[PDB]
Each structure stands twice: as C-alpha cells, then as structure tokens.
Amino acid sequence: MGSMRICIFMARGLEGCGVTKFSLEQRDWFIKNGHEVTLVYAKDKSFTRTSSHDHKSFSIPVILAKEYDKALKLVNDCDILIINSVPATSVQEATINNYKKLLDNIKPSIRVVVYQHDHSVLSLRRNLGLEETVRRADVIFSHSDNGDFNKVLMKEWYPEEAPTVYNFQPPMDIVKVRSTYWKDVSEINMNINRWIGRTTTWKGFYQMFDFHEKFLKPAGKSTVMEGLERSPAFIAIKEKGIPYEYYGNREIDKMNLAPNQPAQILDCYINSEMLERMSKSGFGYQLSKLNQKYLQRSLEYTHLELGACGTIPVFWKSTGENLKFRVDNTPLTSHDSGIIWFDENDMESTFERIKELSSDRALYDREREKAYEFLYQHQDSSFCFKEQFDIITK
DNA sequence: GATACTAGATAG
Ligand SMILES: O=c1ccn([C@@H]2O[C@H](COP(=O)(O)OP(=O)(O)O[C@H]3O[C@H](CO)[C@@H](O)[C@H](O)[C@H]3O)[C@@H](O)[C@H]2O)c(=O)[nH]1
C-alpha cells in the first residue's frame, strides 16, 4: 500500500547460480511494482560463473573485509533489507567480522528479511554468520518446513521461542522468457536432447549419461549436457570411466551435434545463450532428484527455464510426485502437464514418449503449451513474489 | 564404515 526502498544483499558474493538468479528476479519484480532497488554483493570471494546472468550494469560490489563504511552506508539506505546469502566458510577473519558488525548496525527503521536458499545440511554448514543473520531477521523463508534448515539448524539455535519460518518458491517472470525465446515448432531439432545443471549428485547427471548410452545414442539422437564443471565431485566421472567430450564455453561451435557421439559436455554457460540453444532443442532435461523432506512447492530455475523457452520438459518423476502445485496442494504428477516424468527404473517408457512427440509436431506443440501454462500457474513472479511481499509486510 | 553431498593451482 505504498512504495518502499529495497536493498538486496548477497554476502556470499555473486555466484551466478540460483541465489543470483533469485535476486535478479527479485529486483525486477520490485522495480516493476513501483519500488526502488539496489542490489549489493560482497566481492571478498570470487566465482567462475559470475557472468552467467547480466547484472554488471546495476549490481554494486563491495569488499566487506576493507570497506565496512560503504557497506554500512548501503545496507542502511532502504526500508527493507533482504539478505540472500552469507559469507562462506573461507572468507578470512576480516570479512566475517565486518559482516557481523554490519548486522549490529542496521538502523531500527529497517525490516530485515532473510531467505535461506540451500537444502542439505552439508551446504548449510559452510556458512558463516547464518546464526546471527537469522536472529537479526524480522522475517525468514526456506524451501521446506521439513527441510534441514528448519528441523535441524533451527533446533540448534532455539532449543526462548523460535521465529516462524515461512515457505517460499524461487519465482521467475516466465512470460518474459517465453515472449523472448519461444520458437515455431518447425525451428526445433527433435534429435537434440539438452540437459542443464551443475556437477552435484542430486542434479541427476549420472542418469542422463546412462539414458544416452542406452537409448538416445543407440537411436541416433545427440546429447548435450550444459553446466558441468570439473568440481571435486567430478572425480567420480573419472573413476567410472564414463564416455564424454568436454568443451570450454569458448569452443561451443566445435561441439559435434551429429549422431553416434558421446555426451557433449559444456563447461558453464551464459544463461541467455543457453535459453536460445534450448528453445531450438527437442527436449530439455533437468533430473534433480532431491529428497521428500527438502521438497514442498519449490521447483528450480532450470525447471522453469525449460518450460518457458518452448521445449518439452523432462523432469525426474519422484520430484514431481513430492512437490505440490501452488494452486491446490496436489502433486505435480497429477496434472496433464505435458511434462515428461523421467523414470529411472523404466527409461524405455520415457524414451517411447520422446519418440511419439518426436514424430508428429501437432501433439508436440500441444504439450509445450500445457507445460508452459502449468509452470506459469505454479511459479511465475506475478504470484509468488506477491505472496512473499505480503508475508514481509503484514 | 558405506554413502550422499560439496573448483583450484598456475602459467600464458
Ligand atoms: O553455468 C550455468 C549454470 C546455471 N545457470 C543458471 O543459474 C540458475 C541456477 O538455478 P537453479 O536451477 O535453481 O540451480 P542451483 O544453482 O542449484 O540453485 C540453488 O538456488 C535456487 C534458488 O532458491 C534453488 O531453487 C536451488 O534448489 C538451489 O540449489 C538457472 O537460472 C540456470 O539457468 C547459468 O546461467 N549458467
């Protein structure tokens, strides 16, 4: 019921993945709804995927370790301070020290909002100041009431009344993407299967490799996996002697899209570039197989980008089973969504589906629309940020 | 003790 000043703060730094995407998507919504916004991030630690999204023209970097004043001056110039990430466990005494001093000098007329974007305790543990950050917050959000942040970490800090933790969904303006990359069914290459994600076990990269060597490759299809970095978690792909063809983001045009080829792995990607390639690929894959406890209503940005750019979304079954439609709590697998639920113990019925859609384009374009409208209903900004804006205000 | 989950050093 009035225009406010917002400061989005990422103390971990600008990593270029989910948290960075949420902030940018948060900034756009606030701006579109009449509010002034400033996006601030700590550059004490740097990241590879720092340019995946375009923020360079408006984001404001700051070195907490040696710019406390500018930092304090920025975080105090708003009505709502939203912290999406906290210093990592490797920043250096000065950084985590000044960040803690910042939380002690945020004027009284500022409502501090804290979003916890991680899932597993293992990730939650690599945070510094997360406890102080949470106690200073006037509002807290998490991906699941039954996730680790809620059931374990909030138990360690509040064994005199524990703050409420509201649930949220990482929203995105789906229409902007569609209206920008969607293509006519004729421009799509039904033989290019494109997987996107990062090198982490719950991201289902293994099953994509398996699915390619056993179904797509043998059938003349081509597979591209975008976003795999040789993180330590990559050693396992070495031990498992899994066939592949790595490509740096510079030599993308030397990638071989012909049949009878191993999984073509792309290092890391620029988000707008990936969407363009995806909007012209027959099927996009996002096999996140997170566990029941961590799943409530939150789909991931990689999930939403697939629906939004005009491809046929191929997600992990269990995921769509545990998650619930935002409109009526019903499982995502209970709707005629057009989505193709991936079954690990039945990759043949999955492949068969892809084959059908691969033959007649009428049904294909009939399934996109249903998938798009379904993902729109479930997680577009228009709805989700308004839900959060209301919890933050009242 | 089995098992998920979590880019860096350095030279051009
Ligand atoms: O090299 C890359 C890799 C990813 N992306 C993009 O980065 C975002 C990644 O977000 P998401 O798909 O959510 O994956 P995570 O990086 O795992 O995001 C984390 O943060 C999100 C915000 O809440 C949560 O939804 C996730 O579960 C959590 O893992 C997407 O827009 C991707 O298109 C790029 O542009 N380039």
Output the DSSP codes for A200-236.
Answer: -GGG-HHHHHHHIIIIIGGGT-EEEEE-----GGGHH
Collapsing DSSP to helix, strand or coil, A100 comes out as: helix
Gap between the Cα atoms of A164 and A167, Å rounded: 10
Bridge partners, A266 (sequence order): A226, A247
Bridge partners, A142 (sequence order): A167
CA distances to A65, A135, A162, A217, A351 from A152, rounded to whole Å, are: 30, 16, 12, 43, 40
Question: What token pair was written down for A96?
Answer: 């985590």
Give me ligand 1 centre to Cα A109, in Å.
33
Whether A6 contacts A36, CB under 8 Å: yes
CA-nearest residue, atom 36 of ligand 1: A269
Question: What token pair was written down for A339?
Answer: 């989505």
Q: What is the CATH number of domain A1-170+381-394?
A: 3.40.50.2000
Strand order in the sheet with A111-115: A60-62, A36-42, A5-10, A80-85, A111-115, A139-142, A166-167
Phi-psi domain of A265 (left: phi exceeds 0; alpha: psi -120 through 50; beta: other): beta
CA-nearest residue, atom 28 of ligand 1: A18
Which residue's structure tokens are 């043998």?
A218
User: Is there an atom of ligand 1 within 6 Å of A301 CB?
Assistant: yes
C-alpha triplet A193, A268, A309: angle, nearest 5°: 45
Nearest to A264 by CA among A272, A254, A274: A254
Beta-carbon contacts of residue A242 (< 8 Å; ≥ 6 apart): A209, A263
Other C-beta atoms lying within 10 Å of the C-beta of residue A189? 12
Nearest-atom number in ligand 1 for the CA of A172 is: 31
Collapsing DSSP to helix, strand or coil, A64 comes out as: helix
Q: Which helix (H) or strand (E) holds A292?
A: none
CA distances to A65, A248, A325 from A331, rounded to whole Å, are: 46, 38, 6
User: Is there an atom of ligand 1 within 6 Å of A203 CB?
Assistant: no
Q: What are phi and psi of A35, to 5 degrees?
A: -100, 155
From the CA of A95 to the C1' of B7: give the distance in Å.
21
Q: What are phi and psi of A39, to 5 degrees?
A: -105, 115
Closest nucleotide to A46, Cα to C1' = B7
Nearest to A386 by CA among A16, A8, A21, A35: A35
Whether A312 contacts A368, CB under 8 Å: yes
Other C-beta atoms lying within 10 Å of the C-beta of residue A191? 18
Helix, strand, coil shares of chain A as percentages rounded to 5? 45, 20, 40
Other C-beta atoms lying within 10 Å of the C-beta of residue A377? 15
Residues engaging strand B (CB under 7 angstroms)? A 15, 47-49, 118-120, 122-123, 126, 200-202, 229-233, 236, 290-291
Listed as ranges, the nucleotides of chain B within 7 A of a protein C-beta are 4-8
Collapsing DSSP to helix, strand or coil, A264 comes out as: strand
Identify the DSSP state of A59. Answer: -
Collapsing DSSP to helix, strand or coil, A153 comes out as: helix
Q: What are phi and psi of A83, to 5 degrees?
A: -100, 120
Q: Which helix (H) or strand (E) holds A111?
A: strand A111-115
Gap between the Cα atoms of A310 and A283, Å rounded: 9
A1-170+381-394 and A171-380: identical CATH topology: yes
In a mutational test of the pocket of ligand 1, which residue from A200, A302, A316, A381 has the highest number of ligand atoms less than 8 Å from its CB? A302
Give me ligand 1 centre to Cα A273, in Å.
15
Nearest-10 crossing angle of helices A361-379, A347-359: 120
Closest nucleotide to A231, Cα to C1' = B7
Give me ligand 1 centre to Cα A268, in Å.
12
Is A99 exposed, middle or buried (CB count within 10 Å of its CB: 0-12, 13-18, 19+)? Answer: buried
Gap between the Cα atoms of A306 and A284, Å rounded: 6
Identify the DSSP state of A150. Answer: I
Gap between the Cα atoms of A91 and A98, Å rounded: 11
User: Is there an atom of ligand 1 within 6 Å of A271 CB?
Assistant: yes
Is A43 exposed, middle or buried (CB count within 10 Å of its CB: 0-12, 13-18, 19+)? Answer: middle
Bridge partners, A38 (sequence order): A7
Bridge partners, A113 (sequence order): A82, A139
Collapsing DSSP to helix, strand or coil, A154 comes out as: helix
Question: What token pair was written down for A290?
Answer: 């997170």
Gap between the Cα atoms of A367 and A373, Å rounded: 10
Beta-carbon contacts of residue A289 (< 8 Å; ≥ 6 apart): A202, A204, A207, A316, A318, A319
User: Is there an atom of ligand 1 within 6 Å of A268 CB?
Assistant: yes
Extents of the domains making up chain A: 1-170+381-394, 171-380
Which residue's structure tokens are 């009242």?
A394
Whether A367 contacts A282, CB under 8 Å: no
Gap between the Cα atoms of A2 and A238, Å rounded: 56
User: Is there an atom of ligand 1 within 6 Å of A171 CB?
Assistant: no
Gap between the Cα atoms of A313 and A309, Å rounded: 10
Gap between the Cα atoms of A13 and A85, Å rounded: 8
Gap between the Cα atoms of A87 and A128, Å rounded: 5
Whether A281 contacts A225, CB under 8 Å: no
Question: What token pair was written down for A212?
Answer: 């390619």
Is A85 exposed, middle or buried (CB count within 10 Å of its CB: 0-12, 13-18, 19+)? Answer: buried
Q: How was this structure determined?
A: X-ray
Give me ligand 1 centre to Cα A245, in Å.
23
User: Is there an atom of ligand 1 within 6 Å of A300 CB?
Assistant: yes
Q: How many residues does chain A have?
A: 394
Which fold would CATH assign to domain A171-380? Rossmann fold (3.40.50)
Nearest to A294 by CA among A165, A147, A169, A140: A147
Give me ligand 1 centre to Cα A243, in Å.
25
